[PDB]
Amino acid sequence: LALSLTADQMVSALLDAEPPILYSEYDPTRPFSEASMMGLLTNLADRELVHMINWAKRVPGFVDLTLHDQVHLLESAWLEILMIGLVWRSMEHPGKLLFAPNLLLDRNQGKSVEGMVEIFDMLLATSSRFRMMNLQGEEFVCLKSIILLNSGVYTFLSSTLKSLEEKDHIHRVLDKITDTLIHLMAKAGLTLQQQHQRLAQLLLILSHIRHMSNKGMEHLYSMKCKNVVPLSDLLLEMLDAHRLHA
Amino acid sequence: LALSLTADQMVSALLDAEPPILYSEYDPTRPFSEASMMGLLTNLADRELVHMINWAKRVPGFVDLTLHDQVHLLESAWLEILMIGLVWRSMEHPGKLLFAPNLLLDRNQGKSVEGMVEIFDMLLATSSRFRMMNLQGEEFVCLKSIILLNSGVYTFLSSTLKSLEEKDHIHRVLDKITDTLIHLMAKAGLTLQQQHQRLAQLLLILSHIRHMSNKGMEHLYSMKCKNVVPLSDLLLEMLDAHRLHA
Ligand SMILES: CC/C(=C(/c1ccc(OCCNCCCC(=O)N(C)C)cc1)c1ccc2[nH]ncc2c1)c1ccccc1
Ligand SMILES: CC/C(=C(/c1ccc(OCCNCCCC(=O)N(C)C)cc1)c1ccc2[nH]ncc2c1)c1ccccc1
């Protein structure tokens, strides 16, 4: 079980779970101002979501939950998870966002759609902050799993007994990831005082990732994408897998 | 200076800084369905904001900042600060929100304005979570000061030298409040492992306070309050105080 893993085993499992880095799908032989920036980002997000599902299934503790709860967690967290990935990719690219290895965009390119450049600047400031802190890959995968488990855990509909059991388990997994972060920091030599300070600096950036997700979601809902299968159904379909290909 | 305070001195200073608990201003001899719920909450928020300014000036480190930066921090954080106060007041009132000692409202009373009951439920879930964790008053005042200092620190416009110095100072104050939280938890007997776990559980709730603030702000902007002095000017006026009454 998730709750019996050691720190190194948690880290190994999170590292192995990482999704691939995907490419934007545009014709690189054709001009750039043809392309719709929102169309490129939308297509990229849709492909990435399928992989995110595979990733979340490999995060220790996640497939112990109900499919209803798995859907709820991913529905709450998907844009934060995309965003923390984006910021992490972009750390060593000051002033730009690496949406994909063929789609590295600066501030100005942000202006194409009224909205983004606000978000674009928030994302660059976050990447900058991670660069300052010298965020490690092992710390990053802990933080991204924390988002997955934490973002939706305060908005479950019910206090059924099953729901109380599900919340307790989520909170126990989160405690194991905190232990794992502390173990990483100790292993790299920081003092106890530096350990707690760094833990707090990393978790406080998660508040800013939430903010950015909310600002982006505000824009996405305003696009008004007239009757399509709701996100929970699509999540349910990808999550509600059969086992015929095992 | 803020940076030279001990933990006990930080806690004492935060406890002494606490604003008063204000009452809603309605005629308690007259019927309830006369009153506009949004009008009551709006009036309450406006009075509370003046006191919040006084409070923020007493948070160690805050008046070392530029008035521009003080405005920016409060402009980002004011609704989170109101909300964490609300949740704290409501902990020992299961199923209700204590907006004021004469304005304790349940879920159903939330429904008066299309919007709130969504937010209302998030706020009740947060109060419940604090009740579960058995949040202390000393921990609460640390968390509320963290919101004040953290919420806006990733969205400063500039990297002027003065701005870099201001960010470094904010980050040093935040590190002192983390040390203070850890000292509280140690003083109350928790193990080192429990210390870090509790630190993470408290800071992750701040992500949910951000979310709720954003959902509320979405509603407030949609009200479309046609040309009034912008919030930054009003903040500037209360913050940009003379010293003639010293
Ligand atoms: C930060 C940039 C950004 C991104 C973004 C994300 C999602 C977007 O689309 C929402 C989905 N609508 C389609 C619904 C139909 C459907 O699902 N089907 C038919 C299967 C669009 C953009 C985006 C896209 C890809 C990314 N990789 N990493 C990060 C990242 C981010 C963005 C977000 C909000 C506003 C503006 C821009
Ligand atoms: C959670 C409930 C909630 C609250 C709320 C907060 C602020 C509100 O008004 C915004 C200000 N507009 C006036 C602008 C003009 C001006 O400033 N001048 C002329 C000086 C309204 C409500 C509220 C009010 C008082 C509170 N105590 N503690 C918490 C708390 C919260 C709420 C927030 C958003 C949507 C729905 C409800």
From Swiss-Prot, chains A, B:
17beta-estradiol binds at E48, R89, H219. The keyword Chloroplast does not apply. It is found in: Nucleus; Golgi apparatus; Cell membrane. Changing V59E: Has higher transcriptional activity in the absence of wild type ER. Inhibits transcriptional activity when coexpressed with the wild type receptor. GO terms for cellular component: chromatin; cytoplasm; cytosol; euchromatin; Golgi apparatus; membrane; nucleoplasm; nucleus. Widely expressed. Not expressed in the pituitary gland. Residues 6-242 form the NR LBD domain. A lipid is attached at C142 (S-palmitoyl cysteine). GO terms for biological process: androgen metabolic process; antral ovarian follicle growth; cellular response to estradiol stimulus; cellular response to estrogen stimulus; chromatin remodeling; epithelial cell development; epithelial cell proliferation involved in mammary gland duct elongation; estrogen receptor signaling pathway. The modification Phosphotyrosine is found at S232. Keywords: Activator, Cell membrane, Cytoplasm, Disease variant, DNA-binding, Glycoprotein, Golgi apparatus, Lipid-binding, Lipoprotein, Membrane, Metal-binding, Methylation, Nucleus, Osteoporosis, Palmitate, Phosphoprotein, Receptor, Steroid-binding, Transcription, Transcription regulation, Transmembrane, Ubl conjugation, Zinc, Zinc-finger. Binds DNA as a homodimer. Can form a heterodimer with ESR2. Interacts with FOXC2, MAP1S, SLC30A9, UBE1C and NCOA3 coactivator. Interacts with PELP1, the interaction is enhanced by 17-beta-estradiol, the interaction increases ESR1 transcriptional activity. Interacts with EP300; the interaction is estrogen-dependent and enhanced by CITED1. Interacts with CITED1; the interaction is estrogen-dependent. Interacts with NCOA5 and NCOA6 coactivators. Interacts with NCOA7; the interaction is a ligand-inducible. Interacts with PHB2, and UBE1C. Interacts with AKAP13. Interacts with CUEDC2. It is linked to Estrogen resistance: A disorder characterized by partial or complete resistance to estrogens, in the presence of elevated estrogen serum levels. Clinical features include absence of the pubertal growth spurt, delayed bone maturation, unfused epiphyses, reduced bone mineral density, osteoporosis, continued growth into adulthood and very tall adult stature. Glucose intolerance, hyperinsulinemia and lipid abnormalities may also be present. Nuclear hormone receptor. The steroid hormones and their receptors are involved in the regulation of eukaryotic gene expression and affect cellular proliferation and differentiation in target tissues. Ligand-dependent nuclear transactivation involves either direct homodimer binding to a palindromic estrogen response element (ERE) sequence or association with other DNA-binding transcription factors, such as AP-1/c-Jun, c-Fos, ATF-2, Sp1 and Sp3, to mediate ERE-independent signaling. Belongs to the nuclear hormone receptor family. NR3 subfamily. Selective estrogen receptor modulators (SERMs), such as tamoxifen, raloxifene, toremifene, lasofoxifene, clomifene, femarelle and ormeloxifene, have tissue selective agonistic and antagonistic effects on the estrogen receptor (ER). They interfere with the ER association with coactivators or corepressors, mainly involving the AF-2 domain. Composed of three domains: a modulating N-terminal domain, a DNA-binding domain and a C-terminal ligand-binding domain. The modulating domain, also known as A/B or AF-1 domain has a ligand-independent transactivation function. The C-terminus contains a ligand-dependent transactivation domain, also known as E/F or AF-2 domain which overlaps with the ligand binding domain. AF-1 and AF-2 activate transcription independently and synergistically and act in a promoter- and cell-specific manner. AF-1 seems to provide the major transactivation function in differentiated cells. This is Estrogen receptor. It comes from Homo sapiens. The lineage of its organism: Eukaryota, Metazoa, Chordata, Craniata, Vertebrata. The chain holds residues 307 to 551 of 595 of the full protein.
